[model samples]
Target chain A: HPLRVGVGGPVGSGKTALLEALCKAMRDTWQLAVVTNDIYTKEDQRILTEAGTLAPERIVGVETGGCPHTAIREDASMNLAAVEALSEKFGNLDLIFVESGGDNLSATFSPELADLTIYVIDVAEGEKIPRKGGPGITRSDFLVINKTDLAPYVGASLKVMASDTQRMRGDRPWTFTNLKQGDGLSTIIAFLEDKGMLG
Target chain B: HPLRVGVGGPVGSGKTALLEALCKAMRDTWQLAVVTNDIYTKEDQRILTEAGTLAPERIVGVETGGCPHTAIREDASMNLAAVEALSEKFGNLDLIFVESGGDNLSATFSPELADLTIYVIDVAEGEKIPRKGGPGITRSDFLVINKTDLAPYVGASLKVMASDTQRMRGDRPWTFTNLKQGDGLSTIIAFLEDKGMLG
Candidate 1:
């Protein structure tokens, strides 16, 4: 069974972009597969496909047409099935990434589906987002505050965001990233290694 | 009966700020009251009261203690009671705003609760939000793309967001706004007036 890492966040918070960057960073050395959920289309899978992050067959997209939070948390059977299919095809898969349909803060992955969860939020969502804590921000194994480059333009002070994140997340791990610049990608990889997912 | 407008959106999307702005703009000529819903606290109501948008007595806050969406939709008795109480206290009110607690895209008000609904999304949430289309985006009486000033900073092109909103909402009304700058506020007021709510 591969280590399943769930990626969840609100729409346009860069969950797909983070996954693409991760695949690009990790696919070189690890046997990787992905399962992406979208509300009404296979857009994220298509995005990863176009990005050529991984072989087309190894990436699957599920269209969860209703409340995405429900599909990821309440009934994860669809995601689990996607994982099973990937595991069957890639018997020696090291890690599988489950990218949830873009959703609100309350969404989370079932423990039955994800061994670890990476909740993605971006500076563009405002510096106050972290303090509006939900299961994803407060309880996720890791939090990625992406799009650091946009902080100045959005008047989102990274200082405030950082302090708020620290207060909200306590000792849980988090890092700031400007995926466009490949900033903070190594820290995420290092965290994965620290968590023994790289083994 | 006063025109009841439901203002709803995910947390940090500036629903409160929008409501405050609306109150400041219309309270001079209109007999107005507001009911704000929060998950576990009367925080929003307090914020509005402190802002002095209207008299404290005219604003009521309900601590829903459940999914904020439910009080506005499935079981609206709590909110309904608040509305009736306000109506009884202030007869001949011109308009009342029912501000939903921070919630997900799927959240909407029952027609019985709100005669018109305004769904707000921030530019910081990214331009792709409108394309993710939900009842709030597709069916609300008005869609507010708030935090337009953050567009440049977040790399979220308002042009793209506008076009996407047009495609998602068709001829239905939506506007870009920077609540802090008071941009597009007149348009919102005009929409309300055009809908005969201001009369």
Candidate 2:
């Protein structure tokens, strides 16, 4: 059985891009497959494919009609079906990445959908993000601060974001990555490794 | 009480631009407020204010934590709160525009959130769009084919789309607009005028 990792975040905060990064970084070492949720089009799947992160066969997209979070947080049947479809295709799957659609800071995966969840945030959004303490920041298993490369251009302080986050989220792990530049995502890889999630 | 009109559609479908057009066309005749769903940031609010569609105070943004469609369809409490809050501040508002975070063809408004929903598709998205028959295209009270100004550049035919839509929709009405140029939107304004939605 593979460990299911749910990745959720605000729109364009790089949830899909991070999935592409993770797939590129870890696929050679693990038998992994992905299940993606998009409320309307299969844009996430198309994006991941365009990035060439994994085999087209390894990625599946779930359309949530018009209720994206419900398909992940409340009902979860749509995502569950996509995950099952992926596993049935790739029998030796060791880790399954469930990519949730872009939502607000309050979005999180149901426990039924994932063994762990990563809530993604971007530093460009402003300093008050972590301090606001939404579930994505305060309650998710991990807080991934993406696009660190652009932090300076956007006038956001990584140090302040880190320090404030440390104070707001007790014991919850936070990591920074410039997913587009492919910098410093090794922490994510190592965490998944420590959890024995090879796929 | 305002007549709530929700605008939903796929990414790059001209939903925001159409809202701006509506405000410019109707504000003189209607007491308008707006509730916009921003999945990640307040970018739409910025656009609306920049366009001078409505005053900053008249517009509200609901952060859709992770799932943009959730705030519109399955779990619409956040949207409802914004609408109600606007109504309280400005009594007897003629209309409120609820714009869903840019999503795909599967996105729509909850019956509880909008009395009438508008689906904004565009000529750039292709003639095959209406033939696809998703909820946003088929079920919305008004199906707006926008960006008519770009039809030739995108090689999309308005006639094909109109005929295809008419065939699939039976009696359901569809209208075309060149919103960027502010064309053909008066039909929507007329509907509001007839509904006693004028200020």
Candidate 3:
């Protein structure tokens, strides 16, 4: 069984960039594939393919239509099928990344669909996001705060976000990532590796 | 019977900022109040109160707890009650802006809750967002493409976003707004006034 990691966040939160970086870093050592959920367009899937991060055969996009949250959570039959088909096509897959369509802070993946969950958030949205206490923000296995570089531009404080994340997330796990600059790529890689995702 | 308006967009999309600007622009001329929906915090209401956009008593926040979409769409009773209470207290309220918790692109306001709907998307979120084709994006009464100033930093193109929005919206009124600079505040004011919301 491939270790399934679910990536979720609001739109433009670097979830795709995170997945792209992971594919490039671990592909040499692992049979990793990706499944993306999108509302209207196959934008996530197309971007992954065009980034040339993984083999086209290994990338699958599911048009989630009305309820992107449902496609990943409560009723994840769509995502489960997408993952099942991909794993079947490439036998002995080590890991599969499931990226939810950008969603609300309350969004999360069902236990049946994602063995590991990583929630991404953008700094530009506002520092109050971490303390908003949504399930996705507070309980996800790992939280990646992306767009660190935009803090000054957006007048958002990373320090306040970190403190808030600490308060809400307590001791779970999270980090600041500037996916544009690849600033915190190592944090994700190490988390995956240490958790035996590269198996 | 206040003219109810809904301000919705993803987190960090300037929904609150839009409300603040609207309050400043309209409060002196009209008796406008605000209602906000949030997941775990009253941050939205707090922001509005702190901005001094309206009388402290005129702003109300409802904690949606689990399902915010339900609060705004299916069961907007909480928000309706908020508006009702505000109206009862204020009497002869001219307008009320119901701000949804920063939600997915698919988020929308119930017809029972809002007479005019404004769906705001941040330009910083990437231009593909307008083309994403959510009910919120395609069918809202007014669409605000906010944060125009950050287009350069985010490498997003306003031209592409405008074209895509036009393709999706198809002449549904929309405009570019840099809320940080108060660039597009007048569009909202004029829309409200034109729509006879000042009664």
Candidate 4:
């Protein structure tokens, strides 16, 4: 079993962008591989490879027929196989990032597939994103409030979003970032480092 | 094997509405069941039930852990099991409509899981949609361009889209519709009639 980091979020919340940033930031330091799910297209895979976050070979795209969560949370055989395949091919892997297809708040990666899951919400989505108090915001190991750069443009109150997220998350871990600008992910990276997934 | 017609497309592409229409149009003539994929919520099930498309029991929602398409296409055991369960319970099921979680054009029913796949693209997506052809437009058995009524409002040119699609498809069949207003679908119903699924 590998150290799996699950990323879940709503549609168009920049899950792929965050994953791309994570991949790029940890590429040299970590022996990293990624699995992305897209119900209809391989856009996430295409985007990551196009961004050159990691070697294209290190990333695998799993077409999750329709329910993207099924592959990551419930029946994760396809993803499991992909991870194992990557591990077999590149045995020195340190981390595996499984990016969930954009889904609603209740979606979470099954503990079977991922040791820890990161729930991503963007300030552009709403100022009340953190206060929404859904499973993704409350239960995941890390709640990543991303897209801080767009807060002013989207009329979302960043300060309130962060404070509400902090209050809602209580003692459970959380992080915030503007992945578009590649800001505020060192804490997350540090956590991964502690997991021995990154140097 | 169940005669499965897969309905797939992007979010708010009217799969649920189409199911309601199909149930209204064909329930007396066919034993139709529906399978919905949800990441964590049962919105489709609730909607279809509210619309009275089928008996609530006939609609099964597969919580896709988090991977939507994996449940429908890659490792489709859960969906397969749902179809089989429906068949076993209903005994004389004529058609099973497997509604994909709203996905992009890159998503389609696996040929292994679906006997015939219908790719639903809304005219509201834009007239240029067919020009940017993808798997669903090029490979599906039928490409249903829905929401024609909104095309004018959205400034989409229907003629251009259809003809461009025709040129690309060569002999492949396509349909333009306003499912919201029930503009077209006779051709589909008639085709099913030939298969004895309807008359």
Which residues of candidate 1, in runs, are more than 4 Å off?
A152-157
Question: What value does the lDDT take at residue A15 in candidate 3?
Answer: 89
Report the C-alpha lDDT of model 1 over A67-127, residue by residue, as the tens digit. 7777788998889888998999989998999998766666788899888899988886667
Taking chain A of candidate 1, what TM-score results? 0.97
Q: For residues B1-199, what per-residue lDDT tens digits would candidate 3 score against the true structure?
A: 7899998888779999999998988888899999988888998899999989888988888999765678889888889988888889888888889999877777899999989999888987886888877988899999998888888877888888888888898878999998989998997899998885475
In order of the candidates, what TM-score does chain B achieve? 0.98, 0.94, 0.97, 0.93
Tell me the tens digit of each residue's lDDT in model 4 across A1-199: 4588888876555577778877888787778899988766676787789889889999899878645666677788998888889989998888889988766455678887888788877664557556545588888888887767655644568778778877887888877787756777788888778754443
lDDT of 3 by residue, A30-103 (tens): 89999988887888888899999998989999988765688888899989999999888898999999999888
* Better candidate by DockQ, 1 or 3: 3
After TM-score superposition, what is the CA distance of residue B184 in candidate 1 from its true location, in Å?
A: 1.3
Q: Give the DockQ-based CAPRI class for model 4.
A: incorrect
Listed in order, each prediction's TM-score against the native is: 0.90, 0.60, 0.98, 0.54
User: RMSD to native for every prediction?
Assistant: 2.4, 7.3, 1.1, 8.9
Number of clashes recorded per candidate: 1, 9, 0, 22
Q: Write the per-residue lDDT of candidate 1 for residues B30-142, one digit (tens) a residue.
A: 89999998765677788899999999999999978656778999999999999989998998898999998777677899999999999999987766788777889999999
**Relative to the unseen true structure, what is the C-alpha lDDT of residue B41 in candidate 2, on a scale of 0 to 100?**
64
- Lowest lDDT sum, 10 consecutive residues, model 2 chain A, at A124-133
After superposing candidate 4, which stretches have Cα over 4 Å from the reference? A1-199, B195-199
Best model per DockQ:
3
lDDT of 1: 0.85
| lDDT of each candidate versus the true structure | 0.85, 0.77, 0.87, 0.74
